[PDB]
């Protein structure tokens, strides 16, 4: 086993999550079975209690574990599947050892937070890094730990102590620390004193740093690096600069130009880890897929405009997984992406009574879009705008994907505007009216990776061509409310055909509309399973249809 | 070159100076040409300005450099000769670089204390550790640096930075840090939190510790060591305990039982230093001289009482070199020492008018003494008591040594009480009277190691037998005032014979009185040149005469 | 993790089991949490099917796993508790992977013995060496693997391949091979060609040796070692000699004189394993307990004669654990042991009709004994001799221990000879007679470590003093047949008091007879739990009573 | 006998209770102390030498059980004095007030089916729980001061108001137990 801990910061907004998700990617190019752990200093047990307004979207794992965003960034960069244990939190570990007290397992000793709770952290990291994460049950070679918060805090405090002991309870040369740090620029001069005042605290809290990964606004001066290597004890080759480049998928290749694999190969003796040619050649091939997709980003010019239609579009992190899946689908089509933020409530005609500028800008963005996405919203208060965009996408022939709530407004749209029931309703919203035309029903939660089976006649469905025509699809779910299955025999007659269903047959999970270029609902969330070299099939479908050449993508899949 | 820095402390009174003077002694048993450097955070250039009341005696070097006490402890433990450069001070290095500014040598740059002054420290330590110190001009193998003050101060601050750079400007494995530390005991429990709050500051200021040398009141518990080795990163074998033992000459052998040579041989790769058999066998022989003299201390019982007669005897550190030279002379005679502190002014008959108890206790201690010492006092205000003790020592036949002022009160005593001039006077005191019977004259200072030549007829003199009958003696001086040379032809006629003189003949430096068992004045200071295995010949004379067997010591010397 | 594999041999009778049980002991003196694995090339799943005539006694583990003898040697040398998984066998691993085939887990591939079965071995060794074995659930630092059979066989073949891959699937410097070997002596010359013809095969089968542990009849010549170090690639310091010495408890200290800890500390980098002072000081203290008990064996002279009374005494390995527990008890009493082999059937009066010499020699040995043991026999055909020895031990006051069957013949003896039922019988033997005076009943098996609770009045019982007066005893069991609990109220009235019982109260597990110096039955097996520094309390009782000073042992326990 | 925990020292605590009863020395049993006093009195005055702490010797299932489990009972609880109690030195120390409020801990309590025997033999249960079914104080008739309290009297003592059973013990041991009973009741 080996560990690399990514850590530090003068400030908590500094962006450690790319250097974690990008260090682990570079180590995966050596062919190593890499894994990752997030530490979050917040008290939440797991993210399911905190709304998407409050620091971004509610992620989903194979377990159903509603979790921190930063798990998702490692899953999509590293190709790995994570579990709800990979998110260490102050909530979890304190709830764990305090529940263990009432169980009695410390034999009625004191449960001081030094010794015993820092021992539970060091045990949890050693459990979790041995859980398998790739397509086979082989245990990881290297674990990337992202230490949330900063080193020099009061929510960080048990973790930085636990990791001082863990620098020895796992031997040095099986552990390395990467310290992210701030180097401000003021009046044209690079200021390395915030960094030198977090190297003092790092040595004090007891870890010793290996890298000094500065988030400067610039290239670091040769004299700036020379002084950071005088005040921190690292050699000047190790003072990596992580400055902005044309997209975040380039960041691994900047770190590779900055020798970071050659340093980590030495500093963790990675030549002593046992690897097969099936490991190593997969490693060096994955490097060439990353060099190819970044070269394709560097000279892709032909734009594709996708309208993302929903509430809270000013909080873009409320959709981080939706955005990132369109970026994967974009780079695979070799069309450059623009996403058009349509704040759905502005499409509703009553907006014309409040501000006409909003009514025109939103319908302008929607009309300009080469493809349309209803992105699995939350709450109900924007729903009429999401219905109008689904009417537009059906009648104007524009490519369409409905995710989760998106499948459900598509059924509501089709009921109101093709089946001809204008009172038909989201039972998710208009409940205590008790009306008969209910497009949905509550069936109290359903979460995690679940099996979707294709219905028998489905051969013609573009969505089934995009899934490689395989009879079952494994994808991640969230929904309380599902389509009322007593309308399905009507929709099945009117050309709205339910391509895919749950294994009991009673629950509807995919539809495709007959006789449209690409119009799909998926009631699972296709966002979360997308990887940077394997875009999620419904999202690859949307960005292909909107680019043209949907047929040529269907060959690239099925060959 | 190799360095061991002795450092640290929660508190500055903790006693680092033995662990320095005793680490260097253990390394000298490997045969290495060891040297030592004192750092003193005080602003004094050199100790000549600060009176013996204010933190102890005014030392003297071969240069005449009036210096910190702690040079003396290394000289006598290590056998080495030091120079006034071996005392780094905040006074010296700031006076040096600020005088260098007016000379211009920084080419008109800023002389920031980071970079440039910490570079002058790192240059000074590298100059000084290459100065020769043994009986031949061979440069040192290892240098012990004693960092005065504490690590975690404001007078320490440039030194701890300079030594962080010096951990690299000289490579690791040529440098090691020994951190002395406090482990209080309260209500019967050993408290290792003062130590853990100086390991935090040490890592912060940037040095990394190797040893954790606790000054506990006890043996450290196995659980106390195990926790210090959990919070400091040292292994538990390295947490040396430096507790009190029957005399400070045992301390090296406690550190040798605690593996400290075996650790330093590894941690500085001392097997790679080139040594001859003339080095190595001198090393292992010196170890057996230390094992022998400590075994002799362990079962020597026969006491010898020496009266030390002078002012300020409540400030025993005002005489630290005098005390230590009697301890060497004691252990060489194999008699256990008691020193009788005679506060000289109490011997004066006017004390009987003020407090009779003082007059009796002081004359009781003087009468009880097996030998008498006038210890080179300072000022003049106790002089009549020192004259009465010299009258007593001459008439009652008791063994006597006068050092510096001691030779001078012996001439004043002999003038008043044998030559018969009762008005004869210390010109050092009774100056503006302008009287003719002046026993002294001013000749403005005279300092350092100087040559004393024996006068021709001297063959019979016990002091010349103790110096091995060699024609010239090299010893360290301090005196403004010297014997008036126009009385010498009278004293030479009356049996007070000046055994030794300055090379010009005009200055008188040793006398021995004819027809007394042992009665000597030396106007140089014999204290400073004594080593733990080579006691200063006049002091070996005194403690031998007082023990009996002065003749048997004269064979041990001359064989 | 670290591994040392003990292996090799020109011949299979060469005695590898001491070098395994003695290498692991030397590593435990560094304080390392050592464990051990036995590989047995035989096809038996576990030893319960093979009778004690056929290669020695039927061992018992905490699991109830009836197992190979060689587990016992590591348990008693290393203080460890093992589990039935620590005995790898050709039976087990082939039964495992062939049962796994019918379960389907190789996904319908071929299950070649290369790749897949050698992968199951390498998985099993990596599972098993992480199971905890000491008094706390901490996973082992080093694992000793004893490779049964020889390297160069057809029953060895999958293991030597699995261990060639395991030399890499665990890195070199986490693995070392010790090759035991034969160096015959013929016409006075040491013959190192059998050894050189097993170093050829070792290199061929692909492991590389580290040690060459010769079982010569002599000290190896300096020229013999020099040639073995020319033909094997080891340096001559590594060619350890394992010749006979005054008892097998000396063998670790011969290997310690032959540098084997200093070599294994280097060759596995054991300084890089994390140890506490509670580990290290327990390590160096256990070394002094081994130096003390071997020094006590070197000058203990006062004999104690213990009669071991049972069938098959010509097959001494049928009692190996019984013998070894008396040796521990002996060395703890500081009396030298003689065991008197009484072939029990010879005590029966009908032997006088067959051979009087057998009848006299057996009663002579029994009468000569200072103490008597009925050693948990098997079958029934010697039982009348074991009853006569129990009559003798009760009436002649001689110290007595009955183990398992020994407790049961003691109840049968007491019934026939004190309660006065001469027809009372072992229901284990005389079954289909259906008589009413049944001293036993079948209750179909009961195995492994079980809880024995002391009955309330038990305070006076010497056996309860030997167990430290603790209310519950944890010890290993085997019995189909147990004392008929409907006789107990009679025996409890006649002074045969059942000191200890099963937690239900219904089963009787210890008795002590009132008013005899030491007369005990234990229906569990006290042999198996004895360690070389912690002799089994009933056996320490017997060898103490027979030595005299049973009271002084009761202080050594309870202080 | 200071309200111990576990059971492994209990025979020593019984011998000290035998000594304190027969040698007339002043005695206080707190919690477990009341319980070993009942066990002592059963073995050494009532004459059942097999009588036992059911807190220890449980799965023997014997009939002379001096205690029973009744799963926890904690905090400040009301103790009511039994009617005839006027003569009891412990009731004089509580100011003769009919109810006492003090802090409890006990899983195991005296088996209430022995009480009618002890009440006949001069071991009188001065105080009980409000249901009457649980026994909380005893005082032995005809001894200078010999008390069991099954609550813990330690915790309620203040530096200017010492806990009445403990003021009783240190007064009896000092002599002048009567003079303390005036200092209380005046
Ligand atoms: N490989 C990555 C990593 C991060 N991000 C972006 O980074 C964001 C949040 O910043 P991040 O780098 O994850 O760190 P912070 O949120 O600043 O938090 P912290 O510094 O506490 O880790 C999101 O907007 C996400 O789009 C990204 O696009 N690609
Ligand atoms: N740890 C430090 C670093 C610098 N200085 C002193 O502080 C002065 C001003 O600090 P500055 O020159 O700004 O040093 P930087 O570390 O570069 O600060 P910044 O990065 O903000 O420019 C320096 O000339 C130097 O003498 C100091 O006392 N302690
Ligand atoms: N080998 C030694 C070293 C020190 N001392 C004694 O130690 C004294 C002063 O304490 P020291 O150990 O030199 O250190 P501190 O004065 O406490 O100062 P610091 O801790 O700042 O180094 C003197 O009284 C001297 O007699 C001694 O006798 N022998
Ligand atoms: N660096 C540390 C050390 C200890 N503790 C906590 O503080 C409590 C009280 O400290 P203490 O137990 O006294 O630890 P020591 O370091 O031994 O303090 P001392 O040496 O003074 O006894 C401990 O139980 C532990 O939970 C802490 O928060 N931070
Ligand atoms: N520490 C040890 C090890 C072994 N033996 C003795 O060794 C025996 C059997 O030989 P062993 O050394 O265990 O090995 P072998 O039986 O020869 O088998 P192999 O060589 O196949 O391992 C038993 O008689 C046992 O008494 C012993 O007394 N003490
Ligand atoms: N691997 C070897 C070893 C030896 N020889 C030759 O065989 C001769 C006889 O073998 P021997 O001298 O007996 O060598 P040893 O290995 O010592 O045989 P042994 O140990 O049985 O004495 C040697 O002189 C040598 O020339 C050989 O051919 N191949
Ligand atoms: Mg903030
Ligand atoms: Mg982040
Ligand atoms: Mg001070
Ligand atoms: Mg000092
Ligand atoms: Mg055979
Ligand atoms: Mg064997």
A151: Cβ contacts below 8 Å, ≥ 6 apart: A7, A8, A9, A160, A179, A198, A201, A202, A205, A207
Catalytic residue among A86, A404, A477, A509: A404
Distances (CA, A) of A472 to A407, A499, A526, B285: 19, 11, 14, 86
CA-CA distance, D89 to D79, in Å (whole number)? 16
Residues making up chain C, counted from first to last: 559
- Is the sign of the CA dihedral A65, A70, A71, A75 positive or negative? positive
- Spatial CA neighbour of A65 closest among A79, A41, A96, A86: A86
Q: What does the buried/exposed string (b/e) look like for B97-118 if buried means 16 or more CB atoms within 10 Å of the residue's CB?
A: beeeeeeeeeeeeeeeeeebbb
Question: How many contiguous H segments (helices) and E segments (strands) does chain D have?
Answer: 6, 8
* Domains in chain B: boundaries: 2-290, 295-558
Torsion of CA C314, C320, C322, C323, to 10 degrees: 80
Q: Report helix, strand or coil for B144.
A: strand
CA-CA distance, B31 to B10, in Å (whole number)? 33
Quickly list DSSP for A231-248.
HSSS-GGG--B----SSG
CA-CA distance, A412 to A440, in Å (whole number)? 9
Axis crossing angle, helix D177-185 with helix D164-174, rounded to the nearest 10: 140
Distances (CA, A) of A529 to A76, A293, A468: 8, 19, 16
Nearest-Cα distance to chain D for C456, in Å, is: 7
Q: Report helix, strand or coil for A199.
A: helix
Q: Which CATH architecture has domain A295-558?
A: 3-Layer(aba) Sandwich (3.40)
Q: Report helix, strand or coil for B281.
A: helix
C332: Cβ contacts below 8 Å, ≥ 6 apart: C293, C535, C540, C543, C553
Query: What atom in ligand 5 is closest to the CA of residue C149?
Result: 21
What residue of B is the nearest CA neighbor of C281? B222
CA-CA distance, C416 to C410, in Å (whole number)? 10
CA-CA distance, D133 to D150, in Å (whole number)? 14
Strand C508-513 and strand C496-502: pairing? antiparallel
Quickly list DSSP for C196-237.
HHHHHHHHHHT---SEEEE--SSPPPHHHHHHHHHHSSS-GG
User: Quick one: fold of D1-185?
Assistant: Rossmann fold (3.40.50)
CA-CA distance, B70 to B82, in Å (whole number)? 11
- Measured at the alpha carbon of residue B340, what is the angle toward residues B338 and B346, in degrees to the nearest 5? 175
Contacting C with CB below 8 Å, chain A residues are: 168-169, 171, 272, 274
Distances (CA, A) of A13 to A16, A201, C497: 8, 18, 77
B158: Cβ contacts below 8 Å, ≥ 6 apart: B90, B93, B113, B117, B118, B121
Which residues in chain C are closer than 8 Å to D60, comparing Cβ atoms? 456, 505
Q: Report helix, strand or coil for C6.
A: strand
Strand B447-454 and strand B496-502: pairing? antiparallel
Q: Distance, CA C19 to ligand 12 centroid (Å)?
A: 10
| Residue B224 CA to its chain's centroid (Å) | 35
Q: Report helix, strand or coil for A446.
A: coil
Q: Are the beta carbons of D109 and D67 closer than 8 angstroms?
A: yes
Token pair, residue C69, equals 């003898």
How many Å is the Cα radius of gyration of chain B? Answer: 25
Distances (CA, A) of C71 to C65, C92, C120: 11, 16, 21
Q: Report helix, strand or coil for A84.
A: helix
CA-CA distance, B5 to B211, in Å (whole number)? 11
Query: Could you tell me where the beta strands, DSSP code E, fall in C285-345?
Result: 303-310, 336-343
* Cross-strand partners of A308: A341, A373
B524: Cβ contacts below 8 Å, ≥ 6 apart: B404, B450, B452, B475, B476, B477, B509
Touching chains C and B? (3+ Cβ pairs < 8 A): yes
| Residue B86 CA to its chain's centroid (Å) | 14
Torsion of CA A383, A387, A388, A394, to 10 degrees: 160
Ligand 1: which of A13, A15, A88 to mutate, most ligand atoms within 8 Å of CB? Answer: A15
Touching chains D and C? (3+ Cβ pairs < 8 A): yes
Strand C447-454 and strand A2-8: pairing? unpaired
> What residues pack around ion ligand 12 (CB closer than 5 A)?
C 17
Strand C400-403 and strand C371-375: pairing? parallel
Matching fold, domains A2-290 and A295-558: yes
Catalytic residue numbers of D, as ranges? 31, 152, 154
CA-CA distance, A373 to A309, in Å (whole number)? 6
Distances (CA, A) of B357 to A95, B343, B366, B385: 75, 13, 14, 16
Discontinuities after residues in chain B (C–N over 2.5 A): 443
Q: What's the DSSP call for residue C139?
A: P
Query: Residue C168 is nearest to which of A168, A171, A274, comparing CB atoms?
Result: A274
Residue C57: is it exposed, middle or buried by C-beta count within 10 angstroms (0-12/13-18/19+)? buried
Q: What's the DSSP call for residue D65?
A: B
Q: CB of C323 closer than 6 A to ligand 6? A: no
Nominal resolution (angstroms): 3.7
Touching chains D and B? (3+ Cβ pairs < 8 A): no
Query: Residue B204 is nearest to which of A168, A204, A230, comparing CB atoms?
Result: A204
Token pair, residue C121, equals 């071995």
CA-CA distance, B416 to B226, in Å (whole number)? 69
* Cross-strand partners of C454: C500
Contacting B with CB below 8 Å, chain C residues are: 276-278, 280-281
**Which residues lie with the beta carbon below 6 Å from any ligand 1 atom?**
A 12-18, 21, 73, 148, 248, 317, 320
Locus of tokens 């040698």 = D23
Q: Are the beta carbons of C403 and C376 closer than 8 angstroms?
A: yes
Nearest-Cα distance to chain A for B195, in Å, is: 14
Q: Distance, CA A13 to ligand 7 centroid (Å)?
A: 7
- Is the sign of the CA dihedral B463, B469, B471, B474 positive or negative? negative
C539: Cβ contacts below 8 Å, ≥ 6 apart: C325, C326, C328, C329, C401, C526, C527, C530
Q: Are the beta carbons of B124 and B86 closer than 8 angstroms?
A: no
CA-CA distance, B93 to B45, in Å (whole number)? 9
Q: Are the beta carbons of C413 and C391 closer than 8 angstroms?
A: yes
Q: Are the beta carbons of C536 and C72 closer than 8 angstroms?
A: no
CA-CA distance, A428 to A442, in Å (whole number)? 8
CA-CA distance, C483 to C488, in Å (whole number)? 8
- Measured at the alpha carbon of residue D171, what is the angle toward residues D165 and D177, in degrees to the nearest 5? 100
Q: Report helix, strand or coil for A11.
A: coil
- Spatial CA neighbour of C34 closest among C324, C252, C224: C252
What residue of B is the nearest CA neighbor of C272? B235
Distances (CA, A) of C505 to C407, C442, C454, C478, C499: 17, 17, 10, 18, 12
Q: Report helix, strand or coil for A14.
A: coil
Residue C500: is it exposed, middle or buried by C-beta count within 10 angstroms (0-12/13-18/19+)? buried
- Cβ–Cβ gap C281/B229 under 8 Å: no
CA-CA distance, C370 to C391, in Å (whole number)? 15
| Residue C432 CA to its chain's centroid (Å) | 36
Token pair, residue A538, equals 């419904």
Ligand that lies nearest to the alpha carbon of residue C194, given by its number in the listed order: 6
Q: Are the beta carbons of A523 and A508 closer than 8 angstroms?
A: yes
| Phi then psi dihedrals of residue B469, to 5 deg | 60, 5
Q: Distance, CA A555 to ligand 5 centroid (Å)?
A: 70
Q: Distance, CA A148 to ligand 8 centroid (Å)?
A: 7
Q: Are the beta carbons of B370 and B399 closer than 8 angstroms?
A: yes
A19: Cβ contacts below 8 Å, ≥ 6 apart: A6, A178, A180, A213, A242, A251, A255
Nearest-Cα distance to chain C for B236, in Å, is: 6
Residue C283: is it exposed, middle or buried by C-beta count within 10 angstroms (0-12/13-18/19+)? middle
Q: Are the beta carbons of B286 and B256 closer than 8 angstroms?
A: no
| Phi then psi dihedrals of residue D23, to 5 deg | -80, 10
D7: Cβ contacts below 8 Å, ≥ 6 apart: D53, D55, D56
Q: CB of C193 closer than 6 A to ligand 6? A: yes
Q: CB of C12 closer than 6 A to ligand 5? A: yes
Q: Are the beta carbons of B59 and B66 closer than 8 angstroms?
A: yes
Q: Quick one: residue A397, left, alpha or beta (phi over 0 = left, psi -120 to 50 = alpha)?
A: left
Q: Are the beta carbons of B149 and B41 closer than 8 angstroms?
A: yes
Interface test with B, best of C276, C281, C282, C285 (most B CBs within 10 A): C276
> What residues pack around ion ligand 8 (CB closer than 5 A)?
A 17
Torsion of CA C467, C468, C470, C473, to 10 degrees: -20
Query: Could you tell me where the beta strands, DSSP code E, fall in B126-174?
Result: 142-147
Question: How many contiguous H segments (helices) and E segments (strands) does chain B have?
Answer: 18, 19
Q: Are the beta carbons of D77 and D104 closer than 8 angstroms?
A: yes
CB pairs under 8 A between C and D: 7
Ligand that lies nearest to the alpha carbon of residue B114, given by its number in the listed order: 2
Q: Distance, CA B240 to ligand 8 centroid (Å)?
A: 45
Which residues in chain B are closer than 8 Å to C276, comparing Cβ atoms? 226, 229, 236
Token pair, residue B177, equals 């840090």
Token pair, residue B314, equals 């409540």
Which residues in chain C are closer than 8 Å to A168, comparing Cβ atoms? 274
List alpha helices for chain D, DSSP H. 10-22, 32-41, 89-93, 115-118, 164-174, 177-185
Q: How many CA atoms lie within 13 A of B471 on its CB side?
A: 3
CATH of domain B2-290: 3.40.50.300
CA-CA distance, B145 to B71, in Å (whole number)? 11
CA-CA distance, A183 to A239, in Å (whole number)? 12
Locus of tokens 């008018």 = B353
- Spatial CA neighbour of B242 closest among B182, B323, B292: B182
CA-CA distance, B359 to B378, in Å (whole number)? 22
Catalytic residue numbers of C, as ranges? 404, 525, 527
Q: In chain D, what is the greatest distance between 2 CA atoms, to the nearest angstrom?
A: 52
Catalytic residue numbers of B, as ranges? 404, 525, 527
CA-CA distance, A311 to A318, in Å (whole number)? 10
CA-CA distance, A454 to A468, in Å (whole number)? 12
CA-CA distance, A486 to A506, in Å (whole number)? 10
What residue of A is the nearest CA neighbor of B227? A115
C476: Cβ contacts below 8 Å, ≥ 6 apart: C60, C61, C62, C448, C449, C450, C524, C525, C528, C529
Token pair, residue C13, equals 């009778």
Which residues in chain B are closer than 8 Å to A197, comparing Cβ atoms? none
Query: Which H/E stretch holds residue A420?
Result: none
Query: Which H/E stretch holds residue D144?
Result: none
CA-CA distance, B240 to B258, in Å (whole number)? 6
Ligand that lies nearest to the alpha carbon of residue B76, given by its number in the listed order: 3
Token pair, residue A221, equals 């001066």
- Spatial CA neighbour of A557 closest among A532, A540, A539: A540
List alpha helices for A232-319, DSSP H. 251-257, 260-267, 277-299
CB atoms within 10 A of CB B338: 14
Q: Quick one: residue C143, left, alpha or beta (phi over 0 = left, psi -120 to 50 = alpha)?
A: beta
- Cβ–Cβ gap D60/C503 under 8 Å: no
| Phi then psi dihedrals of residue A7, to 5 deg | -160, 175
Q: Are the beta carbons of B318 and B52 closer than 8 angstroms?
A: yes
Q: Are the beta carbons of B10 and B197 closer than 8 angstroms?
A: yes
- Spatial CA neighbour of B377 closest among B350, B415, B354, B345: B345
- Spatial CA neighbour of C78 closest among C34, C118, C16, C127: C34
Q: Distance, CA A512 to ligand 11 centroid (Å)?
A: 75
């Amino acid at each position: 086993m080996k560990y690399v801990v990514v850590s530090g910061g003068v400030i908590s907004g500094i962006g450690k999550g790319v250097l974690a998700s990008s260090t682990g990617m570079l180590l995966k190019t050596l062919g190593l079975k890499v894994t990752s752990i997030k530490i979050d200093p917040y008290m939440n047990i797991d993210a399911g209690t905190m709304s998407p307004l409050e620091h971004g979207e509610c992620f989903v794992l194979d377990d159903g574990g509603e979790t921190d965003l930063d798990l998702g960034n490692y899953e999509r960069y590293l190709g790995i599947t994570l579990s709800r244990d990979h998110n260490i939190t102050t909530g979890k570990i304190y709830s764990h050892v305090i529940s263990r007290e009432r169980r009695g397992d410390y034999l009625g000793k004191t449960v001081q937070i030094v010794p015993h709770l820092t021992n539970a952290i060091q045990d949890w990291i050693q459990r979790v890094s041995k859980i398998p994460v790739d397509d086979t049950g082989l245990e990881p070679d290297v674990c990337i730990i992202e230490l949330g918060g900063t080193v020099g805090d009061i929510e960080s405090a048990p973790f930085v102590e636990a990791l001082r002991q863990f620098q020895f309870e796992v031997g040095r040369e099986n552990f390395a620390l990467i310290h992210v740090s701030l180097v401000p620029v003021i009046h044209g001069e690079q200021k390395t004193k915030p960094t030198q005042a977090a190297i003092k605290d790092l040595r004090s809290l007891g870890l010793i740093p290996d890298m000094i990964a500065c988030r400067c606004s610039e290239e670091l001066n040769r004299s700036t690096i020379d002084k950071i290597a005088m005040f921190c004890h690292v050699g000047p080759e190790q003072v990596v600069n992580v400055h902005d480049v044309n997209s975040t998928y380039h960041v691994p290749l900047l770190l590779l130009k900055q020798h970071m694999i050659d340093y980590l190969h030495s500093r963790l003796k990675l030549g002593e880890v046992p690897l097969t040619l099936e490991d190593k050649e997969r490693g060096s091939q994955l490097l060439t897929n990353w060099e190819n997709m970044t070269k394709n980003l560097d000279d892709s010019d032909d734009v594709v405009k996708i309208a993302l239609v929903g509430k809270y579009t000013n909080l873009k992190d409320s959709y981080l997984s939706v955005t990132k899946s369109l970026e994967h689908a974009s780079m695979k089509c070799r069309r450059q992406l623009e996403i058009l933020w349509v704040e759905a409530s502005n499409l509703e005609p009553e907006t014309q009574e409040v501000d006409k500028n909003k009514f025109h800008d939103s319908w302008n963005k929607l009309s300009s879009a080469d493809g349309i996405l209803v992105p699995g919203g939350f709450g109900t208060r924007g729903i009429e705008g999401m219905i109008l965009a689904a009417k537009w996408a059906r009648e104007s022939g524009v490519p369409f994907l409905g995710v989760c709530l998106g499948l459900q407004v598509a059924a509501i749209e089709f009921a109101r505007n093709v089946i001809g029931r204008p009172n038909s309703s989201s039972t998710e919203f208009l409940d205590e009216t008790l009306l008969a035309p209910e497009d949905q029903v509550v069936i109290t939660m359903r979460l995690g990776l679940r099996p979707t089976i294709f219905q028998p006649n489905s051969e013609w469905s573009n969505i089934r061509k995009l899934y490689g025509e395989v009879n079952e699809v494994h994808e991640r779910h969230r929904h309380r409310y599902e389509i009322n299955p007593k309308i399905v025999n009507d929709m099945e007659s009117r050309g709205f055909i339910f391509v895919g269903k749950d294994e009991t047959g009673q629950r509807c999970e995919i539809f495709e509309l007959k006789g449209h270029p690409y119009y799909v609902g998926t009631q699972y969330h296709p966002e979360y399973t997308s990887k940077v070299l394997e875009p999620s099939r419904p999202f690859w479908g949307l960005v292909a249809a909107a680019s043209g050449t949907l047929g040529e993508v269907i060959k690239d899949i099925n060959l």
